[PDB]
Each structure stands twice: as C-alpha cells, then as structure tokens.
C-alpha cells in the first residue's frame, strides 16, 4: 500500500525521477513465477543502481538550482513591493520543502523495495547492497536541504519579520472562542434589558424617531446579517471564496452577533438618555451626535484594534462601491452596491439629520429635491455599476437589462415627486403626473420580482423537476423555506417602492413617517432574506459571474 | 518495539499465557551468533507448537468459563439491587473485552515474531507453518467471544436499557459547550444591568435589607464558588476526587456562573419590584415570598431538569449535614457543614424573615433565645460532626481539638446575649459578663485563626525552606496570594466573630445592621479564599484524612 500513497504524494512536476516503485514491484513478481535467481538479481540490481545514479544526479542538479535561487534571492533582499519578495521567499521555502520531501519519499521507498525484495527471494544481501550503495551515497547522506532551510527561516525572521520567529514560522509552510461566544452573550443580554428600559420608558418625537433610524436599521442589519453567516456556512455554501475573503482567517457569525450587539447598546444607552435625561448641562440633541460619532469613529478606527482588518476591509470595499465606474466589480461590490439598496433609509436619515442639525435645531419635504437624490444614490451605484461591467464583458443581456432594473427606481422617485409638487401647488397636470407614477410603480415593483425570483434566485428554474417551481440543486434543508420567502418577497417587493414613493412625496404626512418607520425595519428583513438565496445561487449556478 | 507494546498492555492476570516474545526474540538472537540451522529450526518450531497448544488449551477454558458466567448472568437476570445486575453485567463486558484484547494481542504476536524469523533466518517455511498452524486453529479460528459480545449488548439494552442501545454503549467500555458559555454571559450581561438600574432606582427599609441580604449572600457566594472552581481546576487541585464527585460528568466553573446568575437575576427582579412597585393588585411583601419559593422550587425540582443530578446531590448533601451524628463524615459532609459557618447569615434572614411575616406584618431582638440557637446551629452541626469522626477513627487530637475550637462560638454567643440582657435590664453582673465575653472573644478569634493558619491551610509549616512561613510544596503560581491570605484571614477572623457577638446582641441597633451587613458579604468572601488553600492542603497532604 505504498505504491498508492508514493502516487498521491509524488510530485507532478518531478513524476519521473521518482523510483519506479510499481514497475520493481512487477519485476520481482515476474521474476517470483540457480541460475534464474542469480541472473535476476544482477539485472535486478543493475537498475536499481541506474536508478539511484539518477536520483543522486536529479538531486545534485535541484540542490544546486536552489542554492542559486537563494543567492539571488539574498542579493535583492540586501538590494533594500516588499510584500513580492516576502512572496517570493516563501515561494522558494515551498520549493525547498517538496524537494526535501522528494528525497524522503526516496529514500523510504528505496528501503521499502529492497525489503520486499529481501522477503521475496530469500536473501539477505539485498539489505547488504542498501546499505552498501544506499546510505553511503550522495541525495540522503547531504544535508544541504537542512541549513538552507534553516538560513531562509533566519533570514526571513531577522530581516523581513525583524526577529518574529513564530510568525515566519507561519508564513512558510502553513497549513470561535470561548470568550467571543461568551461576550456574544453579554452585549445580547445587556441589550435585552436596555430595550426593556427602552419600552417601559415610552409607555411610562418626530424629529427622534428619524435620527434612531438610522441606528436601528443599521444594527438589524447586522444581527441578520451574522444569521445570514451562520446560515451560509451551514449550509456549506461557501461564502469565503466569493466574497474573496482570507480564507484562513474572516469573520464567524458571532463576530457578526458582538459587533451588532455592541452597537446595539450604544444606540439603546443614547435612546435612553433622551428619555431619562441625565446630567443637563448638556441638551438633549447631544446623544445623537455622540452615538453617531461613536459609530464612525468605530469604523475609522486608525490604530489597529477592534476587528481592524475587518473594519478596514470594508472601508475599502465602500471606497470602492461609493466611486462607482471605475473600479473593475468584484462581487463584494457587487453585493454591498445592492444592500444599499435597502438601507436606503440609513442615507435618508443620515441627510435629514444634517439637514435638521443645521437648519430646525422644512427639513423632510423635499429640501429643493436633495431628499429625493440622496435616495436615488443607491440605485445610481448599481446603475452604474452594471454599466461598468457591461463595458467591460461586453455581455449585452444580463448587465443592460439589470441598469434597466435600477433605472425604473429613478423615473419612479422622480414621477412620485413631480405629482407631488404638482397636487399641492395644484396643477392641471397632476392627474397625469398621477398616472405616470402609477404606471411605473406597476414597472418598478414587478420589474424587480421577477428578477429577484428569475434571475437573482435562480428559482422559477425549468428543470426544476421534484422541486417544484425551483431549480434543481436546493441546499437549504426544508423546501418550505423557498416558497415562504418567494410569497414574502411578492409581498415586500411592493411594500419597498411604495415605502420609497412616500418617503419621496410630502402628500401623506404622519402615514408617511408610521410607514417609513414600519416598512423601514421590514425591507431590511427582506434584504437579509434574499442575501441566502442570493448567495446560494451564486455557489451553485454561478449567476453573477465573478469567477 | 511490539516487545514493549506487549509488555505495556499484557493482562497482568494472565502474564504466563501470552507468547514469550522477549524469549523468542532471545533465541533467535542467541541463534544467529546446514545442521546448525536446521536443528535450531526443529526446536524452534516446537516450542512454538506447544506455545501455540497452551494458547488453545487456555482459550478454551476461559471460553467455557464466559459462557458459563454469561448462562448465570441470563438466569439471574430472568429471576426478575438491579443497578447491582447491571455493575455484575459491566464487569463481564469488561471480562469479555479484555479476554478479546488477548486473543488479538496472541495472533499479532505470533504473525511478528513468525515474520522475525523469516527475515533473520533466511527462510520463508516461517510464514507456511504460521498459515498452516495457526490461521487455521482454534483461539484465531474461534469467534464465539464476537457473538458473545453481541449477544451482551443486546440482552443489556432490550432489559436492562429496554431498547436505549447507545446508552448501553455508555455503559460498557467506556473510557463547557458554546450554549453554556452563551448563557453565562447573557445572564451576566442582564445581572449588570439591573444592578445598575438597582443603584439607580436606590439613589432615585431595614425588614427589607433583612429579607434580601440572604439572597444576596447566597449569590456572592455561588459567584465566588465558580471561581473557585476554575481556579481549582486550573492548578490541578483534583477536586472531583476529593469531593467524590462522578469524574465523567461534573460541574465546572462556568454552569456555576450560570446558576448563580441566574438566582442574581431572580434576586435583581424581585428587588426592583419591591422599588418600582408593579401592579399595585399585588403588594409589596409578595415578592420576598415569591424570589425564596421560586428559589427553594428551583431547589427541590422533582422533574429531572435544570441540573437534576447536582441539585440531588446537593439534596442528599444537605440532608446528611443537617442529621449530622448519624452519617459517617466524608468530605463533602465536612465542607458543607463548615460552609455554613460563613453563610449563618442566610440562616438568620431565614429565621428572621419567619418571625417578620408571621408576627410583624420584636424579631430582630432575641426573640425569646430562638435567634442565639439560629446562629450556633452552622456550629453545633460541626461539633458534632468532629465529634463522631472521633467516635469513629478514636484519633483523639484532631477530631477533639477541633470539637474545642466550634465549642467557642457556643460560648461567645451565649456570653454576648447574656451580658445583653443583663446590660439592657441594668444588673449589677452586667460587666463580669461582659468580662468573660471579653476572653471568649479573644479565645474564638485566636482558636479558629490559628487553627484556620495551620491545620486548614497547612501553612506555616516547618519544612518551608524557601517558601518562607509556608509549606514546601505550593500549588498557586504567585507566593504573593499565600501572604495576602495570611494577612486577609488574620484581619477577617476577627470580623466575624465581632459580627456574630454583635448579631447576639440588641445593644447596637444602627450599627447592629450595617455592621451585620457589611460584614455579612465579607466572611463570605473568606470562606471563598479559605476554600482555595484547604482544598490545596486537602489534594497534597492530605490534612482532612477520609481519603
Ligand atoms: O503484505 P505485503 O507484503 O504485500 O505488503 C508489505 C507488508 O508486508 P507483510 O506481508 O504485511 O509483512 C509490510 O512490509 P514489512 O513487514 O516489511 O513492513 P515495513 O514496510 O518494514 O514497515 C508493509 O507494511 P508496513 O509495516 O509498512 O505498514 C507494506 O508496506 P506499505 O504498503 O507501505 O504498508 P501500508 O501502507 O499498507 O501500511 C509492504 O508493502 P505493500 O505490498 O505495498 O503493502
Ligand atoms: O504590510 P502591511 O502592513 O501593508 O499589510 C498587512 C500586513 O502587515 P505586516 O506585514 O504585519 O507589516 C499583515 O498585517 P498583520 O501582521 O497585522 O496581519 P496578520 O496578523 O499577519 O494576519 C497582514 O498579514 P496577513 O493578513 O497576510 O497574515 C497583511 O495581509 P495581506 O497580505 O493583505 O493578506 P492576504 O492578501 O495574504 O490575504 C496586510 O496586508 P499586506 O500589505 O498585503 O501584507
Ligand atoms: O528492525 P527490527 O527487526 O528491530 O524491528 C522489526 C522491524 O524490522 P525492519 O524495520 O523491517 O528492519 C519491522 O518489521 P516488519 O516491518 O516486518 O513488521 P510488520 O509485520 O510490518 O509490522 C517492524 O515494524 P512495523 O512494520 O511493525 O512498523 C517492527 O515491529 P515493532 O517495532 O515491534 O512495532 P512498533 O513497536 O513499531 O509498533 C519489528 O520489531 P522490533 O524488533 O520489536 O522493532
Ligand atoms: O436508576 P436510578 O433512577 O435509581 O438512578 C440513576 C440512574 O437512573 P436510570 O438507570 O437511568 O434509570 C441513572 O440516571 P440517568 O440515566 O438519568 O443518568 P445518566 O444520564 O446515565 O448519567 C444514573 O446514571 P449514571 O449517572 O450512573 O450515568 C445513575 O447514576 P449513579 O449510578 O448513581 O452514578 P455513579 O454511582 O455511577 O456515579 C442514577 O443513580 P443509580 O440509581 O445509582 O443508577
């Protein structure tokens, strides 16, 4: 059971110097079925000592490529893209590990054939002849492969990793806790009595209910986006390898879990000190600033603590998303640029309280119309963004006729606001501007269900089969799940443009803000909802094409 | 290397019956140092025949002897003490086990020191007369101990499992989670907040502070006893040994927090109703009642949930502290009933708490004496617990000795209360009684000290060296905590004393209370660090001696 595992561990490149360990096992078995005996073992011999002529020749010829690789190696290095040597010299440790392991495998499988042969043909001076020709001999007896490895581990350590020798150790040859479980506990409970407080204070504005928005929509979307994690990677629909996250460390669902419970207890601590004001030197409309500015400065942190490599991830992905059309789309911006398309209510409000501190401290009616552009931002970066991929793989279909979806999210804000403008300064036309907005609401909303359920979820799939009214390939457990979110999401795909309709028009005051505040916190569940089916066709299907 | 593996795992009882493979190995050896070999071949081969014959012949016997034993065991077990049947059926798995493990050890012995023989002699008849020989005889050949086993395991699980077969796997050779850690944290997280909103609510009483201080020590003292638990387990103080606790299943630090934050959680609750009285159908003595019902409920839970193992132990536990000259004294016995001499507090607020809502909704004066018994009764149990372990091992020293130290606390409480009464009702006696208080003060304080210092801690031992004023043998990484515990004990064993006098007394009211309540949750935390260095002296030198 040798030959199996010398044929999985064999290196590709190098499957020829390998002793042909299958090919002597076939000649002593030929052979196995005094004169017959003595003739076969010469030429038995005769090849094994052609072969170990070849590995000493194979092994001298590599040991000295690898001695020159890292004589120019230790030049560049002493010439001061730092990242690309430190690449290169871990390239060159992987090479010296295979060869190391080439000689090895040698070796063991020399000693392995001649014992066999020992076995088989009764006689003891094969054991004579390895330790004769074979460990006396060049390719086991150098040890070349030992102090260069040794020096590259040095050198790495001293001049690249300027003394870390465990962490060189990790960038060569590299193959959730207690206390994050345990602090994921923690923010839960400590925000469960906070939001009870919470409740009990209220019972025991509108200008308050539009600067927590922004929070409470925020923090949802994080608590379900840690449950879209989890329910990813139990449903092994391998989200690191399409976000391209580092695979050996990136964020579990409880990371998820304790950032949204930490936020959550700043937002609930600010509520509660507008209701139970404390300390009244400073006013009331300070706990806003202060929460908000907690927020930022949490996700702008510059010194590396607090989930730094996650937090600057995503400054670069929104770098990224924000200033649209030129960079190349990933699927990363892909997938943020079209969850801004639910958190549109966080950029509303985030507006508006500028607009509020600066000016109310009018401010929701359409402030000369930068409410209904701050709305539409987040359908322009996907407009664009599906422009740019269409300039870019020159594939007319998917990518014009998705800028088609998010053009309808345009003309509907716009005809929403116009047949506003127009009804309460009341024009003649405002039956038609009525009209219009009707027609493309009916347009908007059945335009971006078909593609959610079509093309977004891969359901509706014509080989669906058993499944019925799905694709075939289905990874979530219980096929209730699919037909509750298709009902749900034919539900809240009106919900959403009616919402945005609204928020656009002045006309339902009170009913425009119990709407907004009630549909707000719905189409982040929606979102959350069509992240699964989402992500679980890209796995299988490959929808979006990133890779 | 199989001569170690042999002699490392060979049955100690049947030592002879296995192969002699050390000898073997030794005559072969001796052996290699055509007639030479061929005779040694002759009386090689028939020492193994006649091993292989012993083998057989010893095979034989045990299987008749199982078969026969597993014949008793069906009867005895058709005849119908039960969970005696089942340890008599576990001890035969065992058996049957460990006679399989012989066989399997006999064949791969005899395959390597067969194969030993084919290599060094240069013969390959070794191998034929192992297939002809063995292989084809009983004690290989037989698989009458497989059936067997089967048979075990079923007759196990369909009578004595009736049907539960993994369970029966658990109960034949047999050799904290994520959710735990969770809800440690989250009751944590919800005990914060409400101990700030307690504050709060205080800032924004006396039967009151009477009621809720058992509560409150009896929390702390849980807290305090999960730290101890880790802070066991984590220097290796083998305390499920001491204890007698079941090793494969016992409590470790963090279900302690979890249910000592949850009773916190209980305990925050009912205080804050007793502040923000809720619906006012319901007054305000309800919720005292209604924390100890819900606490003694969750203790003596019939339905095997929330702990049911531990709260039966503890059950039994306590049963055996409080009828205490008749059990024998093992460890727990003697742990808890002098853990009760810090928590006399709890018995006090019990007892107090009876005489409040039976005659008071006075009773934090003597009520007729029955509040001085209430407090020797966590001393008289240890009397006499000291008192029947001398009863029973006749070691005069020890157990007398430490009968003299809890017969101090008789004294002293009995001296405070009468100089009391005497005082109040202005004798002439009152300053010899107060006197003789005076000297049982001291002799208590100093008795319990000294004893505590060396007798329960072991320190100051004379074989210190290094250690200075310590033993030799520490088991707490830095020696800074054994001289803080010094110190720290020195200073709070005369705090309780003076607080137990005090509690005596009606002669201090205000002062008599804050006194009895700052330095309640005080002696609670010194019975939690007298925990840590008697349980070290428990695991080392073994001062307690019922192990
Ligand atoms: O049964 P055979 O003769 O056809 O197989 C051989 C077997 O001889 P046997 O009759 O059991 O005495 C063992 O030889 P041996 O006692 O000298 O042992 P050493 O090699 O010196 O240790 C050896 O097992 P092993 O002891 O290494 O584990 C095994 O190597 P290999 O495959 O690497 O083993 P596995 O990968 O299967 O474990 C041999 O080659 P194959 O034919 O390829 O299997
Ligand atoms: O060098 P900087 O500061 O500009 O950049 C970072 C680098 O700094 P440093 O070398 O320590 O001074 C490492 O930081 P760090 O040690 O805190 O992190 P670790 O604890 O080592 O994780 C980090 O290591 P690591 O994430 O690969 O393990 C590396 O990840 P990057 O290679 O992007 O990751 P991949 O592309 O391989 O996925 C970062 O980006 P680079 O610039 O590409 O190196
Ligand atoms: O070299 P020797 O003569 O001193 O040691 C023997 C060795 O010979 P070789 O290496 O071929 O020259 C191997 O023979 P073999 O491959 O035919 O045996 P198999 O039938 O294949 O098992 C065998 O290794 P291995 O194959 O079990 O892995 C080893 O078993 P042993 O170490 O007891 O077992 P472990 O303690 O390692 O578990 C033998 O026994 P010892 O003398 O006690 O060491
Ligand atoms: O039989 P009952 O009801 O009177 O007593 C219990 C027994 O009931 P059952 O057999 O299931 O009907 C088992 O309950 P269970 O299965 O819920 O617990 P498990 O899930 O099995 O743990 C338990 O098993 P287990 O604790 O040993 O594993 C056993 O522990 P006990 O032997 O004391 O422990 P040790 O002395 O060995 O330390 C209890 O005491 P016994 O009376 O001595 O058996």
Redesign the interface.
Same mark, same amino acid.
């Given at each position: 059971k040798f030959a199996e595992h010398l044929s999985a561990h064999i290196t590709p490149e190098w499957r020829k110097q390998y002793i042909q360990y299958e090919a002597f096992k076939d000649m002593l078995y030929s052979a196995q079925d005094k004169r017959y005996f003595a003739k076969f073992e010469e030429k038995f011999f005769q090849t094994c000592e052609k072969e170990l002529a070849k590995i000493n020749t194979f092994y001298s010829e590599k040991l000295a490529e690898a001695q020159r690789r890292f004589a120019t190696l230790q030049n560049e290095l002493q010439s001061s893209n730092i990242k690309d040597l430190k690449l290169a010299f871990s390239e060159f440790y992987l090479s010296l590990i295979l060869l190391q392991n080439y000689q090895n495998l040698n070796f063991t499988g020399f000693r392995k054939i001649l014992k066999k042969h020992?076995?088989i043909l009764?006689?003891?001076r094969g054991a004579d002849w390895r330790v004769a020709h074979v460990e006396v001999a060049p390719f086991y007896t150098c040890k070349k492969i030992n102090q260069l490895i040794s020096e590259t581990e040095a050198v790495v350590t001293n001049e690249l990793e300027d003394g870390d020798r465990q962490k060189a150790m990790k960038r060569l040859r590299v193959p959730?806790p207690?206390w994050t479980? @345990?602090?994921?506990?923690? @923010?839960?409970? !400590? @925000? !469960?009595?906070?939001n009870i407080?919470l409740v009990l204070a209220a019972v025991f504005i509108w200008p308050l209910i539009r600067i927590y928005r922004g929070g409470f929509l925020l923090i949802e979307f994080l608590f379900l986006l840690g449950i879209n994690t989890y329910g990813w990677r139990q449903a092994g629909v391998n989200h690191v390898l399409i976000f391209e996250l580092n695979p050996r460390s990136n964020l579990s669902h409880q990371h998820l879990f304790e950032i949204a419970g930490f936020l959550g207890i700043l937002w609930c601590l600010s509520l509660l000190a507008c209701f139970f004001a404390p300390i009244s030197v400073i006013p009331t409309y300070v706990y806003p600033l202060a929460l908000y500015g907690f927020m930022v400065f949490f996700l702008i942190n510059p010194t590396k603590t607090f989930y730094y490599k996650s937090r600057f991830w995503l400054l670069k992905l929104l770098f990224r998303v924000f200033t649209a059309p030129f960079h190349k789309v990933g699927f990363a911006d892909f997938w943020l640029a079209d969850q801004l398309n639910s958190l549109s209510v966080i950029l509303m409000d985030l507006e508006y309280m500028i607009c509020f501190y600066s000016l109310e401290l009018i401010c929701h009616k359409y402030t000369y119309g930068v409410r209904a552009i701050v709305q539409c931002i987040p359908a322009w970066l996907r407009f664009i963004q599906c422009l740019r991929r269409y300039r870019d793989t020159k594939r007319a279909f998917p990518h014009l006729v998705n800028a088609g979806k998010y053009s309808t999210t345009f003309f509907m804000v716009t005809f929403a606001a116009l047949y506003s403008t127009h009804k309460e300064r009341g024009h003649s036309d405002t039956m038609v501007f009525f009209y219009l907005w009707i027609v493309f609401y009916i347009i908007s909303s059945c335009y971006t269900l078909i593609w959610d359920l079509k093309m977004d979820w891969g359901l509706f799939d014509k080989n669906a089969g058993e499944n019925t009214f799905l694709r075939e390939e289905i990874v979530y457990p219980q096929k209730a799940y699919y037909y509750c979110a298709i009902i749900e999401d034919v539900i809240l795909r009106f919900a959403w443009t009616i919402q945005i309709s609204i928020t656009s028009t002045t006309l339902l005051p009170h009913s425009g803000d119990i709407i907004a505040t009630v549909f707000a916190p719905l189409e982040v569940f929606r979102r959350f909802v069509w992240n699964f089916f989402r992500l679980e066709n890209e796995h299988l299907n490959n929808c979006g094409e990133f890779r």
């Open positions: 020992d076995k009764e006689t003891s959730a207690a479980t @345990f602090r994921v506990g923690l @923010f839960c409970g !400590i @925000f !469960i009595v906070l407080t």
